């Protein structure tokens, strides 16, 4: 039972219909997806858990689809953000799309038969779409009354000076239509993402039902939190990037070594492919050894090799 | 003084900046406009006051633009409407545009040189506009906080069974953008409409300042009411259409004959080109004649010939 195996790692925040999805996974291979927006020229550790979950699903014989947000990255996801995102130029967004497309590739298998990974660009869903087609064919299905109650944007709708553009208010419709398109064109039945994406995923489930009368599912992975409540995934006052030109393999490895004892066994479950039994045995050995814990060393080795391969790991340890 | 003379006839509900507009009108001819949506294959009495005001401005030496809503008729204006409207198909709206254009034409002079009327179709503003272009270049200028506080829609935002689609919520941006386009393409500085259009007009004034840094203006004409408080422009629970195949010249004429004494002298001011002093002298006549009022007769004769021509007036009396 794949959902139960992910639950043992703490990797399931919410599922739209856990029993129906478990029955669907049990029937054999499905196609699933996760989206990644070009907000920078690199993904960071906030993208890593869902990216590794695509690989976990592919290991269980499902077909992962990585969607790069050519269209959505021109709009900006307001979900649980206090302030409007910078509107980037088309030329800048296109350059970041290509960089992010190359970055996701190593995490998935593009050559393993029927469940080979697919990469898609949601620009394909909107590049030929007239404004009037969007507002009518998609917009008619969205209740503004329901949109203003989505937890993801509620904080933006108190004060006008802390408010939201029509631009970012529309984002929910774009990711909603993206699910309907991936279902109709690619046979995708599951979207995963961080818990912040719950409301964008359920809009897609509801819109796919409205447009196509196909039944699809949502599953969210936790936002990564530390026992001490400080922000996860910052190094010397900036993001931990997956790009070694942005965060050196050395700085990446040192980030993992510096993990708190309270966080390290959870982080092994989130960020590595070590079995639950290996992680549980490491916890016990660290508890009943008397020496300083080695969990941090293992985590730094495992994740550094995953993101930067043996070459990056030797560069970090040189 | 034009605004002053319109006020004498009861034809001015609100002006956005009366002093700055009266100054512009005194300098020389301006271009102004009023929009009509293809909600049906005909205009009705709810359209007649805005249309006659377009005519009054032209007679005063200004250049009227009659905009038919080729794009906006595909979306639907929610302003002060209790309920979401039905969508029409593109092929139907196309047909209805051509019918409304033909209905509006006779009211304006397309053959008087400088101040010749223009027929415009807002489809041209959106026909080649991609959804992402709209959301970015127009949508970034709109605060959802300000939009949900517009009087025209705020009462659709209490309960979802009385709610509003993203489609109709978007209408205000399309009309806003229409003003900006007409400003840049034709030098239009004034939009007139029914009092229901105030918020649609002010979004176009604001958007025009943001896009073009030009000051433009709005003037609303009253929604016509009966002194008895009942709905104006309904005969037998239906609309009074300007199309003689929908509302016969006879029924149209009888609608005016059956005008309340408390409405007739006010309606002579709204709907005819008689002097105030002539209408006042007619009021005097009906006051102290002993006989039946002549005013409802004069109103029926004048408005039937204005709307249906001599042929219509002859058909009304048979
Ligand atoms: N909103 C996500 C990014 C994202 C991008 C594209 C997606 O694909 S679509 O086909 O559903 O649009 C989905 C999610 C974030 O901000 O992380
Ligand atoms: N909303 C108006 C109709 C309308 C139609 C077109 C207009 O032109 S535009 O260029 O501003 O779009 C303006 C107003 C009604 O419901 O009567
Ligand atoms: Na299962
Ligand atoms: Na944005
Ligand atoms: Na509508
Ligand atoms: Na308003």
Author numbering:
A (entry chain B), B (entry chain A): 5 to 322
What are the paper's exact sentences on this?
First reported in 19541, protein tyrosine O-sulfation (PTS) entails the transfer of a sulfate group from 3′-phosphoadenosine 5′-phosphosulfate (PAPS) to a protein tyrosine residue under the catalysis of membrane-bound tyrosylprotein sulfotransferases (TPSTs) in the trans-Golgi. To meet above challenges, the genetic incorporation of sTyr into proteins in response to amber nonsense codon (TAG) was reported. Here we report the synthesis of site-specifically sulfated proteins in both live yeast and mammalian cells through the genetic incorporation of sTyr using an engineered tyrosyl-tRNA synthetase derived from E. coli (EcTyrRS). In order to understand the shifted substrate specificity, we obtain a crystal structure of the evolved sTyrRS in complex with sTyr, which also shed lights on future engineering of the enzyme for substrates with similar physicochemical properties.
We obtained and refined the crystal structure of the evolved sTyrRS in complex with sTyr at 1.78 Å resolution. The protein formed a homodimer, the same as the wild-type EcTyrRS. In addition, the D182G mutation eliminates the potential repulsion between the negatively charged carboxylate group of Asp and the sulfate group of sTyr. This mutation also contributed to the lowered affinity of the evolved sTyrRS towards Tyr, due to the abolishment of a stabilizing hydrogen bond. A third mutation, W129F, contributes to the substantially lower background activity of the c2 variant towards Tyr. This is likely due to the smaller size of the Phe side chain, which further contributes to the enlarged active site. A close inspection of ligand binding revealed that the phenol ring of the sTyr tilted around 26° away from that of the Tyr. This movement enabled the formation of a hydrogen bond between the sulfate group and the hydroxyl group of Tyr37 residue. Since this Tyr is also critical for the binding of Tyr substrate in the active site of the wild-type EcTyrRS, its retention likely played a major role in the background activity of the evolved sTyrRS towards Tyr when sTyr was not available. Another key interaction that anchors the sulfate group is a hydrogen bond with the side chain of Asn126, which does not participate in substrate binding in the wild-type EcTyrRS.
